[PDB]
């Protein structure tokens, strides 16, 4: 239950320099981690300019809950119109101090990120593909639940959900064929063919993967302590102009 709030950044800011100023301001050492991930390793997802820069800023004091574990995750690519976004979990009041310092030090323009319906479908696609230490990608199947809150006159239809079990989801994926985006290619077309609902047009408020994560229109909350690389990448292509 770690909600991730997403904010975009107008500039490619380099964090390996100047973080000592943040350490002096906050009177505590942060555990900045540098990684260079290549998310679209699939040939159909692109084979060039796939490298990202992943920063994991962490206000490390103690490890009991998110009151002392408000992580910060930054992702960046210099070959894009918008070059950087951040996402941070927890509810500590030092996080907005970190954001204010980031603004006042790098001169960046920061705005909250809202996901569209197709963006949420692509994020649900991204959050099942897991990278393994043997450098392979594994699709872990979760019993999804598309959850809608339509606005109709006289509040005729307040809300309606579409629950899809795990074995039915993998059966739909195997029926479509060998694909790496199951929801956008197999689940959503099956829903459209059966019930007539275009879920990329309907007001979709959340899709819930049971036991793993439940992404919303403005936040992503995950049972897992971190956020995988595919979700970060899909958020990064989401905010492009």
């Amino acid at each position: 239950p770690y909600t991730w709030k997403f904010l975009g950044i107008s500039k490619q800011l380099s964090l390996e320099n100047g973080i000592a100023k943040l350490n002096q301001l906050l009177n505590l050492e942060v555990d900045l981690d540098i990684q260079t991930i290549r998310v679209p390793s699939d040939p159909d997802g692109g084979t060039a300019a796939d490298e990202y820069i992943r920063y994991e800023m962490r206000l490390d004091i103690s490890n009991l809950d998110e009151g002392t574990y408000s992580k910060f995750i930054f992702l960046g690519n210099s070959k894009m119109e918008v070059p950087m976004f951040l996402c941070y979990c927890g509810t500590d009041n030092r996080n907005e101090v970190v954001l204010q310092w980031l603004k006042a030090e790098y001169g960046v323009i920061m705005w909250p990120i809202k996901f569209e319906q197709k963006t949420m479908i692509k994020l649900a696609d991204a959050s099942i593909v897991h990278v393994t230490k043997e450098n392979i990608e594994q699709i872990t199947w979760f019993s999804s639940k598309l959850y809608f809150e339509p606005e109709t006159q006289d509040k005729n239809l307040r809300q309606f959900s579409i629950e899809i079990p795990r074995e039915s989801c993998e059966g739909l994926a195997l029926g479509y064929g060998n694909t790496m985006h199951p929801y956008n290619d197999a689940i959503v077309p099956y829903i459209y063919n059966e019930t007539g609902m275009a879920v990329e047009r309907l007001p979709l408020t959340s899709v819930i993967l049971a036991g793993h994560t439940k992404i919303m229109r403005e936040s992503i909350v995950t049972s897992t302590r971190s956020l995988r690389n595919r979700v970060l990448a899909v958020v990064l292509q989401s905010i492009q102009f």
């Binding site: 490890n63 019993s143 079990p165 795990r166 049972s223 302590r225």
Partner: protein
């Protein structure tokens, strides 16, 4: 942390176990004649269906023995009528 990573791994193992239990329950409900919703209702209907299939098998065995007796009687009687 090391212990936090162990807790996360055990959490994932328990989640996989629960998903396997739910998948097995859904498969058993798919094999059920009448469609149920709750887990307890699914298990009770599965027990009732297994007992019903056992009774159906025993009744079919008895029915086949009675049918064989009827066929033997009909054949012997028709042969006797032919001789007469």
């Amino acid at each position: 942390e090391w212990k936090k990573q162990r807790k996360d791994s055990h959490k994932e193992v328990e989640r996989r176990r629960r998903e396997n239990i739910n998948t097995a329950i859904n498969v058993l409900s798919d094999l059920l004649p009448v469609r149920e919703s709750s887990k307890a209702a699914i298990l009770a209907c599965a027990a009732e269906y297994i007992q019903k299939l056992k009774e159906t098998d025993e009744a079919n065995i008895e029915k086949w023995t009675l049918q064989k007796l009827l066929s033997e009687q009909n054949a012997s009687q028709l042969a006797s009528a032919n001789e007469k």
